[PDB]
């Protein structure tokens, strides 16, 4: 069991300069407002913001040491990424492949494109790949031979072969090591691409995907860890995850709420909460930006397009899904590049009301560090480094964070976080209440404990009433 | 009969400094990659990038001499402009009109607005306008009298009167001189504007336009030349040209391919290839902007707005087709001001694929020099001269071209150009192949010679298989 | 080479009672108004209105004898159907397959489904079939063995195998026999389905389709006959046919005029006329319903829907394409079940104006007999026999035809037919004229001969002025 408490999502090096400064910031400000951390990839990596790890057993010295990670465990749950799809081209295992060729003992760890034979144009177009080139890298071996390996993402990320056995060893090896350092929750990064079969989309291929997923879940449970598979596709996949004793992501909530607050409409939101999957980890913002496929169905297309058209002016160029010439269409946008606070027009009341609704949604709530600090789109950071997503990946010095913590909106968010992390009613059962089509009433009951949220989307007001058991009376949370 | 080879579209003075530097670059890089040249207007001109010639019988000394032109004819086809619509106001023929008035023997060579009497506003609205004012210039005669002449374009370009006889004389004289210098292909510039009749659109007025067009074709054949009539409107006009033993423009192809690659959609392209006008000169980019009206019907309107909206960010202010009686009105989009490479987001694979599809399209392919060198939008040049289309009219020094020739994408383009100009299969018959809705299959067969293009618009991939006749085996072209 | 004259489309037994009554009716009224006939299938048939022939070498005694056929030849062109795709299951060739099994010498004449092995679900969904059943018929052999054959249409129609040799003879045998009886023009029924290749649409498969189509055309040319391949799909195929010395169908014209007249719009019509494929056979109504896919592109989707909604009230249930649950969507309708006269709301002026535009469209005009007699939707005939297309397949007795010939509107149409068949200008060249966007101006010139149509689509007015060579002056055709 994880702590039913708010979690902080954060990089190692963007609050302060390293894992030690991160720990300093948490203890100074968040020591009793969060119950866990999701520390974004802190491994030796050579691509894509830490998501091309050479191994899961080392910490990039630029960030700290394993002792600096274990400083968080013992008081906080620890969520860490497991890049189950791919490992770096600089990894010991893949470098051994280039030197020795197919004589390498790590050969069957990777996907060899010539194994599949000729792939028809139809089977190629099926493949759910998000840039405009084939997912195939031609690498040159030490002996001069040219061969191709499966490569979904950037070329420094070589995909693993779940049709062989070696890949399961490596994950089981990684999991054993991470759990020994105190990892409670394994975020299964990009698991949907693990399933390759020519003739299918090679993404979330059923029922193979769940067998791979049940296996990893068993390994984590053996080593005292639960799983958080991250998938950006139709929400029906989140329920499949939910029904296999794993934590799905509440990705539908961010755009569902953004539309809901901007348009003063509680209908689709109440419909969702009433049927939202269980054991999910709810988010508003992530390190990636607001994802659209995750709300298809949850929100009608015309209302999704209203959302897209409303945010376009406050957001940088969106991340696109491939070959979508119609760049202002629901079917074209993959992720909206925007801080969540800019998505609500820097409206304090709207942002707090959103976080309250998140906190009363069933599941473990994660708060992204930029959102924690009510960060705005980082134009300056985005314009250097070229990374489109850095618009939501502010760097903070410890002073700049101390200063952001004094903003009135952050003090308000900080009270919600303390209330959600400590008040016992959230350990009970969720009971949605009746409301009109422009306001939402959410409540939690655990024995004598009870708390009740009411948000009027017409005026962005947030009211929480809770029962103080030490006195029996009903008080107003001041936030 | 023209050479079935790639042609270069180029100015005299924008590779190096003159026609002499131009000839140097052709022999160094393209000597066996092109079979002809379209050298943009190199006559004495006083407006609009050479298109206001005082005569077609002289070479602007800033560019070179007629001897510099004939250096190209001995080895290459020569396509040169015939401004059938207009000649300069500094021309001898028009200056004689200013001095002597209507007593000049060249008076009936020009269109006098006063023939019509009053022109009602309704008759004005029929005529489209390429300037910001009515196409009527008030000129002052030597004796002080004020009279008006028809002037479609800039006021230094005076339109000719094809209701009289003098205009046919001048064209026949112009044609004779150019063919005597080795000109094979006469580009009839803006011939659609030659037909004037109040009560009509004064543009492509039927059937007068075809009689004017059959006449010039007659003169050219006598002097050993074929014609390339330039008309930017519905593709139906391109077929009428094809059916009169003239070369139409494959003007439909550029915006069609831009869409086909951007959206990974081969349906509309495949339909067009199946019915494309025959004996046409195919282009992707020209010395002008990418023209939209030329793809109506070929491409549904909703997809055209998609295409236009996708290019808006990568293109300058568009050229508009305004009507009269309404001179300060946004009007309809005519040409997108953009390099073809910036129109494909500078995606190398997509650009090579575009040229591959062009080169397998039936007809003589022209490659515009900027496209040859994978040039980007020239913001600095456009802002320096104020000419909106100079964003696609880059200047290259001999060094700047030599360096651009070593770019990998230009090396790939140069391999295709050598293949298309030399491989004999293109002299046979075109045979389109079946494919899915995201790929194109084009093939050419001439006896034992056979070559096969496959372009997957999902991944922007280009594959050509050709048969080496001296051995009978099938090889892959490396590009 | 055919007579450039109006042709009659007619059944054998639906004017009068047999072919002799047809000959009687033709000579009495049309003897100098048409130059040829399209006699719909008059062979022994057991399915689909005559299109399931047991042989092309016999005439169904219910219709007459071959002598009744040769009575038309010598004075009229003769167009007869060649069902190149399929022959009846009661045919001599196929019964031998049932009797002997694969030991039959006619075994390789038919397509055996088990030859292809497993067909993936994707390869089945590709198949362009407009029914909701697999195009596979399970037949029981005489020896009890069960095997499957390819069957596009009704189960009495077994498809032919153009991967073998027997199919080509059977056509060559049919063609030799039909041309020996005086047939000029072979209507190649449903030729698009002759190409089978698993993984393709099995319809118009390029370039195989032209391999088959160039073959038949020569075999027909050998025996003094030209071909009329019927295909209902995008017009690009019509030019593809046109460019191989065969006659395409002007299938785009019927719905194009219907829109143009109903909405007073000549824009798309003039565009088509300017570029329409020629050496085509033009039709307005046929023995089939008014076909929608043949005008996609020629007419924008929004304007096609205008047509569909206007015809919905005056038409029976339309024939649908496969799994088209959206019964009010351009992409769903295949053919509109309606006579052409009811499609123009029984407006005499509008119907004549349509026929006038047809007769001046480049190509051989066919007049369907129901259109000839200005027939209305036959509710009674449709509700009996259950055949949805019989709403356009009126039965006429010899009296009923004599009576309809006296209708004022039929007298006008009969004047046009004489003019289009006899006036020599139509043997010259087509010249489209300028007109506003709500009227059409069409003219023909052949030497001294000249005729000029002007149709105002606002008011359905028809005027034809011709140069009478018997006096040299310009007269008005009275219709
Ligand atoms: O309609 P277009 O093609 O842009 O105009 C054409 O005639 C004009 C005057 O000759 C020139 O401005 C263009 O360079 C030429 O291509
Ligand atoms: O595979 C790694 C990529 O996708 C993952 O889901 C990460 O969340 C994203 O930040 C990264 O770009
Ligand atoms: Na693409």
Numbering used by the authors:
A (entry chain F), B (entry chain E), C (entry chain C): 2 to 480
Manuscript excerpt for this entry:
To the best of our knowledge, this represents the inaugural structure of a phosphorylase complex containing αGlc1-P within the GH13_18 subfamily. The MsGGP–αGlc1-P crystal (P212121 space group) contains six protomers (chains A, B, C, D, E, and F) in the asymmetric unit. In the asymmetric unit of the MsGGP–αGlc1-P structure, two protomers are characterized by the presence of a glucose and a glycerol molecule occupying the active site (subunits B and F), whereas two other protomers showcase an αGlc1-P molecule in the active site (subunits A and E) with clearly defined electron density. Notably, two additional protomers in the unit (subunits C and D) do not exhibit any ligand binding in the active region. The αGlc1-P could be modeled in density but appears slightly crowded because of the narrow binding pocket of MsGGP, suggesting a high degree of substrate selectivity. Because of steric hindrance, the phosphate group is oriented downward, resulting in a displacement of approximately 1.6 Å from the anomeric carbon compared with its position in the MsGGP–Glc–Gol structure. The glucosyl moiety of αGlc1-P is stabilized by hydrogen bonds through direct interactions with residues Asp49, His87, Arg188, Asp190, Glu231, His288, Asp289, and Arg390, which align with the glucose in the MsGGP–Glc–Gol structure. The phosphate group of αGlc1-P is effectively stabilized, oriented toward the exit channel, forming two hydrogen bonds and three salt bridges with Tyr335, Gln336, Arg131, His233, and Arg390. Conversely, in the MsGGP–αGlc1-P complex structure, loop A undergoes a conformational change, approaching loop B. Despite pushing loop B toward the active center, the channel formed by these two loops measures less than 5 Å. In contrast, in the MsGGP–αGlc1-P complex, the structure remains in a closed state to promote αGlc1-P hydrolysis.
Heterotrophic bacteria utilize GG phosphorylase (GGP), a member of the GH13_18 family, via a two-step process consisting of phosphorolysis and hydrolysis for GG catabolism. The crystal structure of MsGGP, akin to other proteins in the GH13_18 family, consists of four domains: A (residues 1–85, 165–290, and 347–429), B (residues 86–164), B' (residues 291–346), and C (residues 430–480).
